[PDB]
Amino acid sequence: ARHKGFTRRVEQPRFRWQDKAYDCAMACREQAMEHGFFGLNLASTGCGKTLANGRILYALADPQRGARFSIALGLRSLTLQTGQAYRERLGLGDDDLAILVGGSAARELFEKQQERLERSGSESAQELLAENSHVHFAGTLEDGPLREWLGRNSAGNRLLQAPILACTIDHLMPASESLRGGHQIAPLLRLMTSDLVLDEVDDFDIDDLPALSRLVHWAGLFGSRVLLSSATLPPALVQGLFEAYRSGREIFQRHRGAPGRATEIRCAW
Amino acid sequence: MNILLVSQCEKRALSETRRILDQFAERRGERTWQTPITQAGLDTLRRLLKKSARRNTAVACHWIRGRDHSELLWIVGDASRFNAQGAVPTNRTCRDILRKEDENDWHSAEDIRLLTVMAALFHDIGKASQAFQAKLRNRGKPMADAYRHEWVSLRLFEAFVGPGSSDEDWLRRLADKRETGDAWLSQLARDDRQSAPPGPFQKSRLPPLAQAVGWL
Amino acid sequence: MNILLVSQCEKRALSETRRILDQFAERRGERTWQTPITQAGLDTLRRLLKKSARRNTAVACHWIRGRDHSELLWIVGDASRFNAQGAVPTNRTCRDILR
Amino acid sequence: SELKTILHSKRANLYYLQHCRVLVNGGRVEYVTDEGRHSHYWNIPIANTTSLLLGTGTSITQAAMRELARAGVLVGFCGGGGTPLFSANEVDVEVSWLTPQSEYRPTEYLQRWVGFWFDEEKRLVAARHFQRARLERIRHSWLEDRVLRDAGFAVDATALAVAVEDSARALEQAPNHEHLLTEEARLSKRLFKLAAQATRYGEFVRAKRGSGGDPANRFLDHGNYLAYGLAATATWVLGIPHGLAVLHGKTRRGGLVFDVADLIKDSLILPQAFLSAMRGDEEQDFRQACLDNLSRAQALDFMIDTLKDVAQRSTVSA
Amino acid sequence: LHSKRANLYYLQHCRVLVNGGRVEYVTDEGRHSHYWNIPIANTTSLLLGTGTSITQAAMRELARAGVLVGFCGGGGTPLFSANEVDVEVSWLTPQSEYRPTEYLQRWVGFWFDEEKRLVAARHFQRARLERIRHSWLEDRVLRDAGFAVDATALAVAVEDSARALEQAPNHEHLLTEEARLSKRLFKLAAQATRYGEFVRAKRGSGGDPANRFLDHGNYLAYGLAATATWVLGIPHGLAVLHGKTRRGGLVFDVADLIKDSLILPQAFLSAMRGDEEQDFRQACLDNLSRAQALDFMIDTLKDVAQRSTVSA
Amino acid sequence: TILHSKRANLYYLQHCRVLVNGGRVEYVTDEGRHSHYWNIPIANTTSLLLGTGTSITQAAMRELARAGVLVGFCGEVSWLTPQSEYRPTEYLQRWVGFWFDEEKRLVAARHFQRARLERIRHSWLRVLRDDATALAVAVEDSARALEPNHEHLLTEEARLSKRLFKLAAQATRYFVRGDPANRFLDHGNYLAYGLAATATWVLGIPHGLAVLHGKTRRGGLVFDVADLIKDSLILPQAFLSAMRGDEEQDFRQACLDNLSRAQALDFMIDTLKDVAQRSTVSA
DNA sequence: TTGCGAAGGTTGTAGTAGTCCAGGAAAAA
DNA sequence: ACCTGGACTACTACAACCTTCGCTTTTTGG
């Protein structure tokens, strides 16, 4: 909350459209909090979309309480320098942005230990996250409301605490694509408690788009607010994704907020 | 047209607005004016008040349009001292009295709590089987169990509930603490038999809530 | 008919008149009320005010009879605060100035 | 005697609150809003109010309710923004009224009314009278109010005359309740068409159950509830129970409010909703304009007059 | 629970709100207050008393379940506002949880026949003269209270009134007999209490403590009767004994059943002890609760309709 | 900024000092232990009258003249006209061209009398409600008398005023021109004189030059212009108010209301312009 | 982890008027 | 021995925040 960098105006004339988008965010904030949100970002390369995304998403959140959101890249592996570059472009200290280095693990590796661990019947004791992954964060960690169940210093609690997260989409996809174990607990809690930003989505291969659609649907089903970001979005993809988000949002409104209100998503370009 | 002007300025702003307004209307109160004026006079009054306004200026103008009707024309300066109709708050305070943090809007929290708690109390029940106990006490080579313990738990639950019965039946039966007895295990349609019995989730086998609990 | 009521009350009388008048009209200011009302309700208003009035009470009522014309109906309490037409002095001073 | 000096038909204010708490402060009934670092107290002139509709995130205390009842002011909870309080399957509940019980109301009208409600044919005659009055008022409002014409409400007189005459012919010939209901629906659709044409809105379709998204449907759904409040207070003032519906009871609980509301839901609500949607206004502006228009047309007086007339004619025919 | 038959609960010092789809009471005594054992179903009704508030969401949930709600005054009387009960007929069959009533039909089925109204008035008078005896004679607590009731004179007056009531041809004669019995009972109580000569001043003008006590007891009893008729579902205007013009007739007719048998002793006792208003109010409420008045009023009101339909 | 006709206030003060206080123009009146300051809305005033026991400070005259308001002293009445403003010239040029020639000056003097008579006729025919034949006869007789010399015109006007006074007295049922009617007439005459001075200054014609009362007294044009409204409304108003048994202040407020309701200033200015135009036409 | 509104006491601020001293003005078309 | 503005100086009315504490209301034409 009260981050000056996202509020400061920009003097360079090449960076005025960012101010325009930031103003539109306030213009649309009120109705988005109640009905939803589905944003697009078609700024051409070289316009520094990262700062625009940060500022726009911050503007939507209520100023009194603060803001939370996560950034996901369509990259198989996220090198540390990329995360630090994101920090620099956003201008956030190491105490406010966690980085999830590495890539996703293999499915079959966990199997052999599980069969070995099945001798004791404690199959519920498997770690939530893989061992390779590490969360580079050094902020507050003592006043976690969920500290009891997730572990004092396990990766899960660190992931949940950080107000802003940077990761790859392969690290959130286990929310809906998980078939065994409890790999979907931490990312699902993250989805419920925060918001989402997808970056370079069309970088995905053609045959991986069903999974992305399912993730977007579930993201809309638990009260998040999605914002794609790229400059080469073919219309069919955008239409399909909007339909999925709306299908998810309709179910959510039954179980939250004032009953009876209509379903009018608050789109933007 | 006759209008009513009310000021809610403070500090030096008050003296300025008193100076500007007292040229057009007779003073009907310590902060109220009223007089018949023409349109041009009103426009020039608005201009003059706008020119020299400060942070602590708040002046409202009401028009008595006709019979039993009056409207708010404009507000000069701060707009947080009046609501839409031009009324003003009577009192103020800092201590919260709405205290709106006690009540939440999770309209299905209780259903989730009940379904989960009931599902929790039965979930690992299948670990009572002799094969499972022997595996627990077995230190030698392990043999994978012919059936997953969750499936055994589901079969035990299905046998207890009794096929084809409405929800209230098994709910009441369970709730009655006096009722005890192992006479309902004769309906445990084991899946090791030569003829495979129908799946527990078919329409005639379980009532709705039973299936909701069984899935978990 | 729509009316305009201005309260010049003082000390304890202020709370009482604020209590009574608040049942009938909305507040347009720290000491101003204004709303439409019928003659019977107005008479009840005046009677109630008179009953519990005190030494400091001072209330005035104006009537917007028509277009570009207004009249003073009555005053309850001390009429020294208002002049004949219903206006109010802008300032006071104990120091003689007229001489 | 003191608080109830002003008649219900001469009071001016009608209220619709949200996100507020109603309580007694210093001997007065006030509602408190929130502004972040401060809270404000706003006063309510109970001696100049008729009804009170409470929306979302509201609450009220016993002292406030006791004060409200003493002055004969109705209170009713409603789902915010024109949507019903509670809806499920075929169940619907638009408002949950809390009528006063400490007051004693006249005994003539109740006795005259209950003296026919248990007779089918007399109920049919009462319904026919209701519809006749509705058509007459519609014609009056649409062809005799110059304010609507000045605001920009223009309708081809000939089409309106044709529609109303056809409706009157069909209505008076209705043999049973169902024909009356269907004919009323037909007239409603025709009036929708005409109103849409008058202000060049274009193509319009009326949704149901508050599922509309275009401004016209939302404005109409919200404008319905003001009529419900006026109808409720009009029925109470005469001492007639809300349950003794004559036309709409078959589909609602406490139908008489809906029956007596229909007299006004088309004379001043439809034109004003369409005008506002054309202007691109918002909920607050439409609500304010509609309330002013109702007060200027003296709707509550008309509702009371019609109820008295229907009861009297029912008695006389016997 | 004021009455076992009505199933009517009373709440005080409590905030009613909803947390996760369930109505919750917050009050001192935490999660041990017995307000958690209130069946929320079609067969419940809630009355909120001193120091209470209700949220809009709570009343949405209550309406979803089908529970009526009303705001009463300190202790359960008087009634300020409440919901309304709809009628039950072959037609007019909406889908809602609220359970409707049927006594309005049976009541209206005879109120238009003058002779049946005469029979009903007879039944009311008989009930009152019956209960006066029990209150003024059998009560051991009242006997220990201090005011001494002479059996002989009270029996003579009760028998005389019973004879007079049985032989009243028109309403006016019944009213005259009622006035005579009231005056005689007033005199007997005044003699018993040693208060001296007393009268029932008009307009409540009486400055003596007895006058104030009588007015206050009357106000409480009228409130209780209003609750009674609301619970049952009959309207207030449909008077039985009073004139057809007098507004609120039925409330006073039903209220009279208990007034002369419960209020009268208490006012004189308080005047003799010279107690304040609050203590007198508390004493009246305690006596009303012990005598279980509301149950008797409801039972009598149903019994009249049952007899009218059986004799039909 | 506001046309002089639109301004809706005219003051008549007494026992008060007019001074500037905190940049505002206010007049002070004693009360006893304390003294009171009442404000004058200069931008909504047409003229100001100072009675007995009042004084003014030059700093106030500066503001008054700056705003355009007019000032004058009474007890006939001496007027101070703000010279710091520049007024239209063409109307004055036409009026002086008319007034230079005695022969032309003779014409139209009865024209104002005719206009006043027409105004009286139109005004008499519903406020006075809250004989038509006799009134019409008197109007026709007056018109016949008015339509050789200026002295005859003055005598005819005096006869018309006498007849109107008699008719008004008959309607009231109470006249001689000590009674409250005479004092009320005097006060109304003072107020009408103020309105006439205001209108003439608004037009820009010189006050000194007169029409029919020039020999009578100084500034005869003001009295002549006042006569039109004086006959039209001052008489019935004063008669009714005196009959009601009302104080001077009540009568004055009533007269101001009646003049305001009638839009008298517009009447007088339009009639003056019309007379000037017709006189120019005759030339 | 715990109602609701009133009365009495305490604490802080804006607002009003008296005192004394110093300067004396308004800028077209 | 003139007349306003400004700076400075008391010095009261208002308003809210903090503690206890009782819980009604005339109740009359019904």
From Swiss-Prot, chain C:
Protein name: CRISPR-associated nuclease/helicase Cas3 subtype I-F/YPEST
Protein purpose: CRISPR (clustered regularly interspaced short palindromic repeat), is an adaptive immune system that provides protection against mobile genetic elements (viruses, transposable elements and conjugative plasmids). CRISPR clusters contain sequences complementary to antecedent mobile elements and target invading nucleic acids. CRISPR clusters are transcribed and processed into CRISPR RNA (crRNA). Cas3 plus Cascade participate in CRISPR interference, the third stage of CRISPR immunity (Potential). In this bacteria Y.pestis-subtype CRISPRs do not confer resistance to phage DSM3 or MP22, but instead are required for DMS3-dependent inhibition of biofilm formation and possibly motility.
Self-association and partners: Interacts with Cas1.
Organism the protein comes from: Pseudomonas aeruginosa (strain UCBPP-PA14)
Phenotypic effect of disruption: Infection with phage DSM3 inhibits biofilm formation; disrupting this gene restores biofilm formation upon infection with DMS3 infection. Normal biofilm formation in the absence of phage infection. Decreased production of crRNA in the presence or absence of phage. Disruption of the entire Y.pestis-subtype CRISPR region disrupts crRNA production but does not alter phage resistance (possibly OLNs PA14_33350 to PA14_33310, plus the flanking CRISPR loci), indicating this CRISPR is not involved in phage resistance.
Domain of life: Bacteria
Family note: In the N-terminal section; belongs to the CRISPR-associated nuclease Cas3-HD family. In the central section; belongs to the CRISPR-associated helicase Cas3 family.
Gene: cas3
Swiss-Prot record, chain E:
Keywords from the UniProt entry: Antiviral defense, DNA-binding, Endonuclease, Hydrolase, Magnesium, Manganese, Metal-binding, Nuclease
Keyword Calcium assigned: no
Activity modulation comment: Inhibited by EDTA.
Database matches in InterPro entries: Cas1 (IPR050646), CRISPR-assoc_Cas1 (IPR002729), CRISPR-assoc_Cas1_C (IPR042206), CRISPR-assoc_Cas1_N (IPR042211), CRISPR-assoc_Cas1_YPEST-subtyp (IPR019857)
E.C. designation(s): 3.1.-.-
Gene3D superfamilies, sorted: CRISPR-associated endonuclease Cas1, C-terminal domain (1.20.120.920), CRISPR-associated endonuclease Cas1, N-terminal domain (3.100.10.20)
Residue numbers binding Mn(2+): 178, 242, 256
One GO BP: defense response to virus
Cofactor note: Mn(2+) supports cleavage of ss- and dsDNA, while Mg(2+) only supports digestion of dsDNA in vitro.
Cofactor(s) recorded in Swiss-Prot or TrEMBL: Mn(2+); Mg(2+)
Record-level Gene Ontology MF annotations: DNA binding; DNA endonuclease activity; identical protein binding; metal ion binding
Enzyme class, spelled out: hydrolase
Domain of life: Bacteria
Family indicated by similarity: Belongs to the CRISPR-associated endonuclease Cas1 family.
Subunit structure: Homodimer. This bacteria does not encode Cas2; Cas1 must interact with a different protein to insert spacers.
Biological role stated in the UniProt entry: CRISPR (clustered regularly interspaced short palindromic repeat), is an adaptive immune system that provides protection against mobile genetic elements (viruses, transposable elements and conjugative plasmids). CRISPR clusters contain sequences complementary to antecedent mobile elements and target invading nucleic acids. CRISPR clusters are transcribed and processed into CRISPR RNA (crRNA). Involved in the integration of spacer DNA into the CRISPR cassette. Acts as a ss- and dsDNA-specific endonuclease.
Protein name as annotated: CRISPR-associated endonuclease Cas1
